[PDB]
Subunit: 191 residues, 4 copies
Amino acid sequence: IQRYVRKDGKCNVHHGNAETLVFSTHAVISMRDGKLCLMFRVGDLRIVEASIRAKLIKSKQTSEGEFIPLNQTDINVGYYTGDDRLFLVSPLIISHEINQQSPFWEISKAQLPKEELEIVVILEGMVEATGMTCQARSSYITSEILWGYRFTPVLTLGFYEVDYNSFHETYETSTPSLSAKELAELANRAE
Amino acid sequence: IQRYVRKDGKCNVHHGNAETLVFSTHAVISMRDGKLCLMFRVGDLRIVEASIRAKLIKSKQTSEGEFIPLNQTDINVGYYTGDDRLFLVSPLIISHEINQQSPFWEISKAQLPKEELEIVVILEGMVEATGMTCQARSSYITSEILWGYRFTPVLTLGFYEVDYNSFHETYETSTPSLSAKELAELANRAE
Amino acid sequence: IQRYVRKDGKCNVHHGNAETLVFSTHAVISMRDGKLCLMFRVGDLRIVEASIRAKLIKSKQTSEGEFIPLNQTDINVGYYTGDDRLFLVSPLIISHEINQQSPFWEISKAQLPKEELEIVVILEGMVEATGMTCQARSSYITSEILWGYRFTPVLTLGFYEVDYNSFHETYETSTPSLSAKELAELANRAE
Amino acid sequence: IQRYVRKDGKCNVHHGNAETLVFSTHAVISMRDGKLCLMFRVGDLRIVEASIRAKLIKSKQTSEGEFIPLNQTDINVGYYTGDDRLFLVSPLIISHEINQQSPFWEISKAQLPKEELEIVVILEGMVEATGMTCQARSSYITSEILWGYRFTPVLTLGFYEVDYNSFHETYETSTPSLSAKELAELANRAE
């Protein structure tokens, strides 16, 4: 029985091939555990208070008729479950469940071609060798979030190996084109 | 497509004209997305664990007949959504939704002239160049929160420019004079 | 209009008479805003991430018949509202609302003479002059929590002065002798 | 009346017999306060922001038919009550209540022999002598979580002594073999 973490804490991972492996180049939207999800991958420069946060940047007009040049809307990535405090040894695909509280609630494969936004990702977590306070950030514009895609796995096992050549790799999978909001609407009247 | 944040994290912002641009001189109360909101602006001395908190300081007599010289009441500014963890590159207008849980629940344009309070704002966030732990504070007395006002935008775009000459600038906009509490009461009997 | 905090953040407080003024010597239980409350006072060695936490230490037998020598039970002091992140310039009386989720739910003035417990208080908050990480702790045994008592105020105003000679001072006030649990039971059948 | 913590904060504990006493060698599952609970013990290398987090590592196939080599699922250990911020002077047995939100919801004494998983525990808390940022980790594979076991106590009292020779010691106690999920199902139809 090959364990991932030793009783004394040492991780049994083998990493195998510039900060190009910190964040995946694209993010995707697809189904996982019955939910449409915004996903992107996180690695390392290769977890002391390692926390992740995501914001949606976009222009929008409020119902009051006010135009907001660049408004920030939160993107729940675990803050409500502690899942945002990452145990970050091997690559992790961060998941944002699209629900009625999400800024992507009414985003559909069709609306994506019209919408213009920017998902900013911020990772903070004191370093391993100095415990120093560092922050890495990334961004995903509208054209960098792939609807109907899924990430290829990077972990396998006589070592627990990470294949970083597939870090940024995704592929298409049958996915409804509807937005979660349209889905709740359909099911309600297609029931 | 000019992006706000580069794939490697660098921000594409141009700041353009003493810590006078950290907090806006006044705060305002007006409608945003269907809700009466207490708002004030945040900038920088020009975000590692950049967090904001707001407290309402005021004297009050409890129902037990006890007079509290200076009582502190919390002012929700995102603690319940993670929105209080700021991504603070360009100016941000902090929003406090006035609801049944807010200390301003029954504050009306009329009561404002009678009430006496002090909103203290506290910003904490390790610095960029040393990652050091710093804290900036500000205050807004009753006469410094403008009912029926809205902040002028400061961002525009071939750069993403911040015009700090309008940082403290606000203007009047038609706003109901009622307190959120009176509003729920009216709607209930004006329905 | 004398303000508590200046626009630039400086506090306008005058402190006036060994770490004897960090925590009040006793804690009390009495009514505030219609709720029976456990209270104790916090000062300073005279707030960068200044947070407070309270635990109840006591022996107890679980319903499974297991005797727990020293069990720790949480004492909510604002963790669910952000109120536990203290803005700590002048003395503050920490409040623990006794409800169905509190370990003191069924504690009555009568049971107090029988019960044996220990409320441990832990304060953490990077220091002002170095921003260093410090922690101060205190304890209140059963005989150090005064039922039917209230703390004397310490703040007044041409300065905003703190009189630390009354820091530890409390006095008796008419208070129901019932536990919050008995109170909900009475009201239910005395309605 | 021997108190656990002095008024000035000093702890009145006597520790009595390599980092072998940081985490208990096994974890157990048994009943405490009417709930089936995953438990393990925490000690010290012998609490400034001392926080604990637990993750469940395992392979799983999503309903979409996707095989996840090593998926991480959160294990609630107090994040929703503040109980995860440990006051860590004497040994503490961390408790994870198995409910509908837990990854062990449907784990039974029978399924345990079939299941393969890994509970990773991560403890973070600035040190006492330097206030430095340290992290200790441990792991419990499926064969290291004992169903129907309970930990022996380690505390007693003319000192408040910790007997670390029983730190890792557990014993069997009558415990239902059903998973919490089967239990809710039984009670529903055995009512």
